[PDB]
Amino acid sequence: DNPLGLIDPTTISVGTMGDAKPYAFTTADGNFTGFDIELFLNVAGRLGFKKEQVVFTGQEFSALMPSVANGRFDVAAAAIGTTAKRKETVDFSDGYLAGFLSVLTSEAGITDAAGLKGKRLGVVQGTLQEIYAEKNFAGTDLVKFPDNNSAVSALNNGTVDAHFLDFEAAKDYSARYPALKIAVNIPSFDAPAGFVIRKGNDALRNALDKGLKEAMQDGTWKKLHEKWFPGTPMPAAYLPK
């Protein structure tokens, strides 16, 4: 009666974020939107779940995987990079996005990674950016923030020199706050975004993988990517055939 092993067989409960625009964010009415959200919804329709049967709940990034592991949500979707470390806690669907980690700075700020020595760099707790910075930015003071909004506020108030976040979100903040610019782009192609599910929920993982493959094959993935990330390169792996 519950082949997908959901908390409630009538609905899919998804954990996401309100401040990861354009991957996942809320409209002014509060409804979730963004690339990951519209992609998940299109995948869910293929699983037999209409938009009205999918509930989105925003949390701080660090709460998402533990919330899935503890059975608070059926899935998490928020540009969650697939890593061996994370696979110890949750299971992942096939990948659906591979891009860059970006250092966002002010108008007269840092111009390269070496320029980060002796600087204050914002990072969101639990992100791949925090891991990358601790491994490759020795000598940079890392300032932990619960979300991007608080970190960008600190950057704008001059209390951090830069913020480390996902490329598309850095690009969006650079448009909202025109003085801000992307100083450094770090590849993160080895940690493609995947939907996160409870370890062992093979039925749901298999179903999301099938829907993702179908969405990529019929050009839905491409359409959503062109809508939400205009100008960003799309790899053949996620495009038709």
Ligand X SMILES: NC(=O)CC[C@H](NC[C@@]1(O)OC[C@@H](O)[C@@H](O)[C@@H]1O)C(=O)O
Which residues lie near ligand X (CB under 6 A)? Answer: 17, 20, 61, 78-81, 97-99, 124, 127-128, 166, 188-189, 191-193
Distance of closest approach, residue 174 Cβ to ligand X, in angstroms: 16
Distance CA 68, CA 76 (A): 7
Q: Which is nearer to ligand X, 151 or 207 (CB)?
A: 151
| Residue keyed to tokens 């050009």 | 219
Q: Which is nearer to ligand X, 235 or 240 (CB)?
A: 235
Distance of closest approach, residue 67 Cβ to ligand X, in angstroms: 14
Q: The tokens of 4 are what? A: 């997908």
Distance CA 83, CA 98 (A): 12
Q: Which is nearer to ligand X, 4 or 40 (CB)?
A: 40
In terms of Cβ atoms closer than 10 Å to its own Cβ (0-12, 13-18, 19+), residue 199 is middle
Distance of closest approach, residue 36 Cβ to ligand X, in angstroms: 8
Angstrom distances, CA of residue 81 to CA of 27, 206, 208: 24, 18, 16
Q: Which is nearer to ligand X, 4 or 37 (CB)?
A: 37
Distance of closest approach, residue 52 Cβ to ligand X, in angstroms: 25
Distance CA 96, CA 230 (A): 16
Distance CA 42, CA 207 (A): 12
Q: Which is nearer to ligand X, 21 or 181 (CB)?
A: 21
Going through 27-80 in order, the beta strands assigned E by DSSP cover: 32-33, 54-58, 75-76
Which residue's C-beta sits nearest to ligand X? 99
Strand partners, 123: 144, 164
Distance of closest approach, residue 58 Cβ to ligand X, in angstroms: 11
- Alpha carbon 88 to chain centroid distance? 19
